[PDB]
Design a protein around this ligand. Structure first.
Ligand SMILES: [Mg+2]
Ligand SMILES: [Mg+2]
Length: 196
RNA sequence: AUAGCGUAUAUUAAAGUUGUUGCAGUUAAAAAGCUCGUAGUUGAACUUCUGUUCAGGUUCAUUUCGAUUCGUCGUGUGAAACU
């Protein structure tokens, strides 16, 4: 299952595990055939989440190569559902994203596109951390000391999926992104003129 | 006022009575009869945010302490904004 990676050269126990998983799946499910055909992985990181629960929960973040992204997003629910089954942890997916530095412009003729920027990329990471669902809203809080703070408003209907994942997400985001993230569930409010 | 003191004239403050700071324009002087428009002046938001760690001063405070004196130094400790 080095076929599932871009380096193929070296893989951790964790990456051996995920590779073998995606193998097992491309074999079992005709559902995911095409989707797992097109998905190549760059990287896999593992995380340990320890909370006041005394529950130490292993959580896995897997990095899809950018060209597999559309297909990944198409297969997301089925995929995370089956992968959470094949390992006793929970899974997340991201796109592998480069970041171009502000003041070191390497080539005279290349304008660093905003698609790769510290911010935009980090934000995108959040969008992926929630991946089956989406932000209903996002707000930033300034505390009195000068700490920035994030809090995010989420579709009611997706509570089932996202409830336990929250801690994992805040741990991951605090780690990679350096950001404090909070969540809320509201109902998605559509403003309709209904004719009764 | 005073070995000086009147007067005339230009100029300075008085003057926010030339106004960048800083004026006015319904009725005291003051918005052009009305639109288009070139020079001129004027221009929406986004890009390494951010946490951690070490040092160095510099300010800050003092139920930290000291040292001397007519008040500086040293030392805390923490607070910081740094670099
Ligand atoms: Mg009149
Ligand atoms: Mg501007």
């Amino acid at each position: 299952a080095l076929a599932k990676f871009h380096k193929k050269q070296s893989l951790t126990k964790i990456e051996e595990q995920v590779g073998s998983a995606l193998v097992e799946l491309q074999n079992t499910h005709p559902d995911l055939k095409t989707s797992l055909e097109s998905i190549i992985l760059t990287q896999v990181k593992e995380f340990q989440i320890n909370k006041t629960n005394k529950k130490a929960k292993s959580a896995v973040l897997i990095y899809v190569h950018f060209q597999s992204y559309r297909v990944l997003l198409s297969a997301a629910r089925k995929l995370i559902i089956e992968l959470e089954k094949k390992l006793k942890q929970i899974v997340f997916f991201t796109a592998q994203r480069k970041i171009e530095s502000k003041w070191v412009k390497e080539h005279k003729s290349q304008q660093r596109p905003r698609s790769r920027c510290l911010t935009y990329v980090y934000d995108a990471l959040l969008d992926d951390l929630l991946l089956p669902s989406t932000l209903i809203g996002k707000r930033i809080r300034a505390r009195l000391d000068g700490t920035s703070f994030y809090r995010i408003q989420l579709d009611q209907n997706d509570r089932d999926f996202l409830e336990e994942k929250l801690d994992a997400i805040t741990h991951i985001y605090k780690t990679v992104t350096t950001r404090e993230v909070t969540f809320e569930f509201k109902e998605d409010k559509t403003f309709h003129t209904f004719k009764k």
